[PDB]
């Protein structure tokens, strides 16, 4: 019949606010006219502006839409223009990157928020509360445009990750995995994204 | 008589080479012009009448353009439309 | 095809209300337009063809105006003509 | 058949240079849309610019044209826009004005030049030399736009004067007249203006 992610794009283009800031990030983030290299900093800057200036209603539709097929997931994954905002030659160690984020006020503030709002309700109950769903979505969306820009990593789940791996962890291996799995396997974050596209 | 008018269209309706399902609001300028108000058109109209002069008068045209419109095509590539749509109209 | 053209006229030939013997060079824009080059006209032309849209396209018009022209009428009063004449032309 | 002064106006309007600067003085000098008061200083400023930027060929035609009837003389007299550039409520004493001109560099420089170039050839021969005609015309035209702006004073002669009289001269009466008659009754200046419109 179409898409929910495509449904979202129509709502955004037909809204003067969303449309303006969408184009304001696509501009510095998009290549593909030649392959070339984007200005990562202008792109990141434009991305932060998108989620801070456009209301959640329109700005989340784009990012947290539900999908029925692999084509839909590909649209959803291109939301943030990953070729520019996300991927690099290699992936650094995650703890290395965590350190690099903590030296940037903006990123440090955002990572703290993610870790605060996107965690289990209690000591056994995997999922967070439902009225905490919005503030977790606010924190994940907020990471976009930082050095810790995340994205969806496959077709069959709502698993997300930043651009880092746990190669060269040494004795710190479990903590690195613990950090990366806080993105990849977050029960509260999956459930918040599942509730937004109700069903 | 020179007015702005808005229509809700598919991006493919624009016929600019794109294969997408994405959409837009396209705006345009319509109507006839006053036939005066500048000195230049007063002179064109007067020179035509005394036949000391078909090319001449003003047109209801865009004086301001809308914001850029972005979209993802069916082949997962983004595109940006610039000055595709009008914000205000005047006779110029 | 959109070109500048110059004619030597009497100020009275302009029919702007003046009774004088003074003179000028009047310049104007003539011809038809390319029918493309903007995104806006490409869309107007395309919307017309698929009939999802007579008012539309661009016109060969002045993009720059000449210097003010002054003259003494037969009743010993001066007058100044502003933006009466064109310096350059484009399709707009 | 028309006019020489009108002939001059056509030549000026059909010349890109002359036309530009003509309009540049008419603008600040002309009223007559309402009666109002012009900005004398902008007008004077525009007038000096006219004769300094436009070649003598075009700029003199306007001012020194020959006339056959009284209508022609009226056109010639309106050249400098006298209602603005020339006349005032009252006329001061001429020697007073001469003093006021000598306190302004621009006017002092111009008055000297007039008195230098527009004088008799020798001690008896009334008229100046013919090859000195141009430099006298340069000096008179140059006075236009100063506080000593002159103009033609009648219909039956090429007599000119500034806006001053010799009322309240006292013992200085003859010198005041001597100063005013250097404009009104200048043999070299009349002859230079007669030679320009050859005939
Ligand atoms: C736009 O696109 C679809 C294509 O499936 C078409 O069927 C529909 O009529 C169009 N809708 C508009 C212009 O609102
Ligand atoms: C302008 O005016 C005169 C009026 O006597 C007219 O006879 C003449 O043909 C005109 N000359 C031009 C347009 O060159």
């Amino acid at each position: 019949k179409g898409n929910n992610c495509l449904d979202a794009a129509k709502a955004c283009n037909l809204d003067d606010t969303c449309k303006k800031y969408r184009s304001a990030y696509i501009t510095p983030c998009t290549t593909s006219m030649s392959n070339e290299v984007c200005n990562r900093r202008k792109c990141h800057k434009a991305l932060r502006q998108f989620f801070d200036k456009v209301p959640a209603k329109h700005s989340y539709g784009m990012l947290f839409c539900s999908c029925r097929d692999i084509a839909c997931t590909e649209r959803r994954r291109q939301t943030i223009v990953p070729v520019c905002s996300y991927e690099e030659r290699e992936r650094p160690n995650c703890l290395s990157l965590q350190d690099s984020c903590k030296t940037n006020y903006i990123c440090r503030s955002r990572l703290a928020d993610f870790f605060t709002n996107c965690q289990p309700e209690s000591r056994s109950v995997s999922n967070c509360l439902k009225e905490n769903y919005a503030d977790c979505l606010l924190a994940y969306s907020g990471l976009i445009g930082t050095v810790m820009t995340p994205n969806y990593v496959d077709s069959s789940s709502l698993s997300v990750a930043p651009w880092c791996d746990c190669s060269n962890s040494g004795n710190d291996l479990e903590d690195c995995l613990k950090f990366l799995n806080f993105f990849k396997d977050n029960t509260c974050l999956k459930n918040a994204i599942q509730a937004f596209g109700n069903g | 008589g020179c007015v702005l008018t808005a229509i809700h269209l598919n991006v493919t309706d624009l016929g600019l080479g794109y294969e997408t399902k994405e959409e837009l609001i396209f705006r345009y300028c319509s109507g006839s012009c006053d036939a005066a108000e500048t000195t230049y058109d007063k002179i064109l109209k007067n020179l035509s009448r005394n036949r000391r002069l078909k090319v001449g008068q003003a047109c209801c045209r865009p004086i301001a353009f809308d914001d850029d419109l972005s979209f993802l095509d069916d082949n997962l590539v983004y595109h940006i439309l610039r000055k595709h749509s009008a914000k205000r109209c005047g006779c110029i």
Side-chain angles (χ1 to χ4, degrees), chain A residues 10, chain B residues 7-13 20-24:
Chain A
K10 172 186 157 189
Chain B
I7 188 158
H8 181 216
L9 303 161
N10 277 301
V11 170
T12 51
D13 297 333
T20 187
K21 301 277 178 293
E22 287 225 37
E23 303 196 357
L24 77 172

Side-chain angles (χ1 to χ4, degrees), chain A residues 6 9-10 13-14 16 19-20 22-27 30-32 71 74-75 78-81, chain B residues 8 11 20-25 66-74 76-82 84:
Chain A
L6 268 145
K10 172 186 157 189
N13 276 1
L14 267 47
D16 303 332
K19 132 160 137 268
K20 171 146 79 179
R22 194 199 183 192
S23 278
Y25 86 80
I26 293 307
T27 301
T30 52
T31 51
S32 305
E74 270 301 296
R75 165 170 282 270
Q78 305 301 318
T79 292
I80 66 158
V81 198
Chain B
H8 181 216
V11 170
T20 187
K21 301 277 178 293
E22 287 225 37
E23 303 196 357
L24 77 172
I25 306 293
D66 273 319
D67 292 313
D68 297 356
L69 191 121
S70 288
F71 64 99
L72 186 86
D73 75 2
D74 292 339
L76 313 176
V77 179
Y78 282 106
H79 298 267
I80 318 161
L81 294 175
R82 273 181 216 79
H84 61 293

Side-chain angles (χ1 to χ4, degrees), chain B residues 2-33:
Chain B
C2 164
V3 288
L4 179 60
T5 345
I7 188 158
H8 181 216
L9 303 161
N10 277 301
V11 170
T12 51
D13 297 333
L14 315 175
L16 293 162
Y18 308 109
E19 303 166 59
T20 187
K21 301 277 178 293
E22 287 225 37
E23 303 196 357
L24 77 172
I25 306 293
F26 171 75
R27 297 202 293 188
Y28 72 93
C29 309
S30 53
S32 194
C33 283

